Amino acid sequence: APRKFFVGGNWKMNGDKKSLGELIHTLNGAKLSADTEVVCGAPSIYLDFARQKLDAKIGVAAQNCYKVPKGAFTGEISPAMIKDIGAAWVILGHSERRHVFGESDELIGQKVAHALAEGLGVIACIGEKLDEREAGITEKVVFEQTKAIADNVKDWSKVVLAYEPVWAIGTGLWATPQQAQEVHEKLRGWLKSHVSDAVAQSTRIIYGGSVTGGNCKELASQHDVDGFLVGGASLKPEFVDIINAKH
Amino acid sequence: APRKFFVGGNWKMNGDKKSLGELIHTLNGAKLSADTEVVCGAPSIYLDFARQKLDAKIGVAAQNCYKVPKGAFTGEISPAMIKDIGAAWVILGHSERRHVFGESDELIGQKVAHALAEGLGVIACIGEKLDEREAGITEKVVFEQTKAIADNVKDWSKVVLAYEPVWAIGTGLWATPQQAQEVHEKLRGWLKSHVSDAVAQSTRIIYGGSVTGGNCKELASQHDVDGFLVGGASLKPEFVDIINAKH
Secondary structure, eight states: OOOOEEEEEEOOBOOOHHHHHHHHHHHHHSOOOTTEEEEEEOOGGGHHHHHHHSOTTSEEEESOOOSSSSBSOTTOOOHHHHHHTTOOEEEESOHHHHHTSOOOHHHHHHHHHHHHHTTOEEEEEEOOOHHHHHTTOHHHHHHHHHHHHHTTOSOGGGEEEEEOOGGGSSSSOOOOHHHHHHHHHHHHHHHHHHTOHHHHHHOOEEEESSOOTTTHHHHHTSTTOOEEEESGGGGSTTHHHHHTTTO | OOOOEEEEEEOOBOOOHHHHHHHHHHHHHSOOOTTEEEEEEEOGGGHHHHHHHSOTTEEEEESOOOSSSSBSOTTOOOHHHHHHTTOOEEEESOHHHHHTSOOOHHHHHHHHHHHHHTTOEEEEEEOOOHHHHHHTOHHHHHHHHHHHHHTTOSOGGGEEEEEOOGGGTTTSOOOOHHHHHHHHHHHHHHHHHHTOHHHHHHOOEEEESSOOTTTHHHHHTSTTOOEEEESGGGGSTHHHHHHTTTO
């Protein structure tokens, strides 16, 4: 009935076999809450390794994919390949893909539709830049990005939405609990009016942007924040504390 | 003195464990000419698998990488990771990177410098579009693309240039042997004038764009064509024939 708390780790472009191996050993050995759904997003080269080594109870996500199953796209991977190695999730629309690599809402929407058709879960990311926030246009931006995704989702049961203020990613500035709650409750109301009440009540909306062991309890306690997408701290032992933020 | 014949296979976004497993078994079982240097470019998610399964005389290439060893670049992999799993090459500046994904000359140049600094070999791609060839400007386009790469190269010993006309990639159209020789010869004279004689004489310049079992011998016979980068036919048993083009 209540939405299951969800914590994702995004390792970004970090790790080697030795260091990722150590991190995974730690996670497997920790006491993690029975009521948190945990997913680790590994570099593509280490997806197979990560799935082999991680406790099955912990999910594995790719950090990107492309929009068709196969073909002449040098350097890309498809949902079919991700499923083949046993990963169950993909992260789409991350700030770094949008703003460093130039991925448009239209591309991201096609990626979302293809991932879902192939049976993967999607962590779909949205968020505003500082200049947008300061111009009063957070709601407009966040709703535009969300519509582009929603228009391409036919089954909401394997979607998680991640709200990541761009100014909060990797900077140490985090949104206040009140800043996060405002956006998350507005996103939920958007889902209610534009999709359905059932989808609004069931869909996890998670916060990302400088989540650490020090701030996770306060953020987690907000009524419409259902978890986190964690970058820098997901490579450290305090990731365990974040997974257990509700306890 | 002369240059070792070089054949790279670019698998692009194709395969699964089962299917690539059967392809690797074929290559390992085949009689491949000892005087051909062979490299297979696998999808990033299968790079570790491919290097584990392929006989040691066959080199493994990543299909792309980014320009720093680590950091906040969701979806990317670095040379340090490629090296970690035991691959020795990377393909950079592929037409699909430049034209589907919008990678610039300056970015490709910074990727080349970084992969070389980290001990990888680089297969560096250049090529003109149909409209450029028809306008009669092939030479201008290849010489600018080449200058971008070369300004970032201090040791040419681990660099292979791949001339691939964009209009020939995946379509079945191939440059005539005379068209390919013409460009290769001009590229070599540019390396002579702007780098050195010895680099000109030692650097392999390979041709790609719809190389098959049927045209490889006619292509390989040209003086300044030192090998091939093969896409489509690299997933097929005739790949063995292409490796053996000189015999």
